[model samples]
Target: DVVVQAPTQVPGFLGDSVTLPCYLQVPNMEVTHVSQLTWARHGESGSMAVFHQTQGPSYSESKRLEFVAARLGAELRNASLRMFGLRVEDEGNYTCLFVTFPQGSRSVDIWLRVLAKPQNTAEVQKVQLTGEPVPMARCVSTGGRPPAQITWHSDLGGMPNTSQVPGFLSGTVTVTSLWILVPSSQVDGKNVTCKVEHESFEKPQLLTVNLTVYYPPEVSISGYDNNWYLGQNEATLTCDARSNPEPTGYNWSTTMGPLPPFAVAQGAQLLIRPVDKPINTTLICNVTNALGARQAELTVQVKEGP
Candidate 1:
């Protein structure tokens, strides 16, 4: 009886070159000699690759299945089958068979499994302070024997929706997932994670998504005097516009009269040296940024003396 030895299964990832072990003994035949040896996947069409003692190596014009003659050239060190650039299509049960005159026929079953890592395709977008509904984010992974599952991680609540799909011609597996969250200004610049779990992975694949948030300005005006006698005393006006992403520009004006002769308009502050009238004046400040704009007005009751 002829004896044969080979691995029952093998593991590999995409874009890798791997060898399926195939070694055996003949019925009184030398290790360096054999009539013929061939490798194939039964359920997956025809032979993956073929070999002959005198014919060298033969394949079906596929990118994956290739021959590796590492040692002895034709002196025959082993009858192992090697493949190149593995894809989802190459993951399946394989048959390694050897035939000789006295050895009759001997074969072994070897399985190939390919793994593919998950990836993220969506970028961070601006979030509204009013809690408006956010757009869905995209995450995907393809060309895996068993499809990977998508998941999300953040302080916000909600689970991602995923769908399984098949690859072209190869009939392997792929998965796509979408996640939605209405981010608030508090979450700005925070790290939200997208994760994928698969049977082939020892740990889940993760990706970080930075959050960008926007909010309207909360405005207030300060720095005024209750009593005013127009002299060298300057009644300074200061505007505070608090906002997410920061205000870009500020405009200052007053409703009481024409621009003050000694009024200094500097950024968010307005400096008035003296006033013609001593009562019923209002300071107006308007702030603007990329998200939106806002205005604030401050009333003053300037009495004579003090």
Candidate 2:
């Protein structure tokens, strides 16, 4: 006249503790004695926990199982096993056995599962601006149980490539998500974010990565209002360029020949002492950096002075 009550499944988090519930119920009997109680894991060849009235309780000598003990009160009717400092290898099926006076041994199966929180990181790969598509950034979530899901958020047209693999720990997994984009100039100086979702996390984790695309300078000529006349003095033309590594060199010339003697060519500015007929040609500006160089043209018109 005995019945056993226990949970069908038990879940525990990594570096945590859990209790496998197993209770013995005796009807109309207040002071009943059980011969023995035992707790063992399936597929394992050794006894994990054993309890006897004459010998007391004994547990395995494993490192993580150092805190294994029976949840007992007045009598040993509650044959529940409490385990602490759970690890990935501790996930498996457990059997709770009870031996009664004449009813022999009764056993119940409890499945144990372990959960782990993943380490997340996101980074943008250093890439050069080009005409083809390339990988911009990658997001990773490692050592997570049940695998982690990753999502990318960006305004730039990008495609995501997601992959999964087994983690270093047993019963765990790793996930890697890549952000692919066409190496366009617009991708430089932009930001992209990745969201990681997992059962172990209290909420979804977010990580942002700034993209850097390197390219040659984009040259432009400015400081010209088309007011160059015969008497105009101190007239200057500035060459401006935008690039990832910054323009290292600036060379100014004219379409016909070298710059006129009146035009002084400095680093990025061309100063004209006095506007004249020789300065009314196409002004060429060549801006260069480590990547390469680019040029801009500006034609000037010198009107007759009043």
Candidate 3:
């Protein structure tokens, strides 16, 4: 008698079924008068017969075993053992025994393993902005095993600020924060992504979101008055600049000279003190903030000295 076995062990999860195949070989006679065809599990004491081909016996007690027989040729036979509704504890070696009248018996052992599936969850929260000189955003996730990593990337292939955070699990949870310096109006509606990866899972989870960054109001010099007499004439130059959010103050100065001992206030100003004819100068006004600064200059002409 010849015994055949599977080339590789079959793997499955809980509540799944697996099939094991066995083939036999003989000379010319039909495989008849088989005393017993048995399938057994290997235990510590010895072995327990899970199924036996005996009539009128307690054979239906085992809930996990099924047997089928098929013919191959005049000299070959096929038998299969199937186990269903597998559990974690149902991992070990199984043997199939075929006993004949005078030809004795033959047995084959096959190994089986059951694996536990990994569980994980991920999400992409709304993009966050630091609202600083350089704005930044962060991606977040939860409920994964240790060593799990999160990556922040863009489909457009541009660089983004990324931050990684450690988790309580042996697996690591990851966060990616993207930073955009001097962001423009174009980036407001761009696409951003967060990807989550774990060792046990075959594929990574991805979350996509759009970015909307709030920036500090921009400052610019609208208009300023120059080419005016200083000193005797009380010359006041007004600066008109616009900002999304109103600015705190307007900075006034002169390139050729300082502000004439005069009155200065936020956003508006007045310059006094007799304009010295000998002085050739330029007046400069600057607007500034924690975000940015803008300045404007004007040329001034003074009357000739007597």
Better of 2 and 3 by lDDT: 2
Backbone clashes per model, in order? 0, 0, 20
Give the worst 10-residue stretch by lDDT in candidate 1: 69-78
lDDT of 1 by residue, 1-306 (tens): 566787777876677788887876544545434567778787556666777777767787656665565233464435677788887667788888876555466788888877654343545655576555564355676655556777888777555667777843254567777666665655677777778777777788786677777776767888875665656477777898877779898987777655445667889988877666665657778888777888888776655564
Ranking by TM-score: 2, 1, 3
- The residue-by-residue lDDT of candidate 3 on 51-109, one tens digit each, is 33444112334576665453222222455667788765677787766665566777777
Candidate 2 to truth, TM: 0.66
Q: Which candidate number maximizes TM-score? A: 2
TM-score of each: 0.55, 0.66, 0.40
Candidate 3 residue 27 C-alpha distance from true site, Å: 7.9
lDDT of every predicted structure (CA atoms): 0.69, 0.80, 0.53
Indicate which candidate wins on lDDT. Answer: 2
Greater-TM-score candidate between 1 and 2: 2
lDDT of 2 by residue, 109-185 (tens): 99887888888998889888656677889999998887898998878758999998998877778899999888766
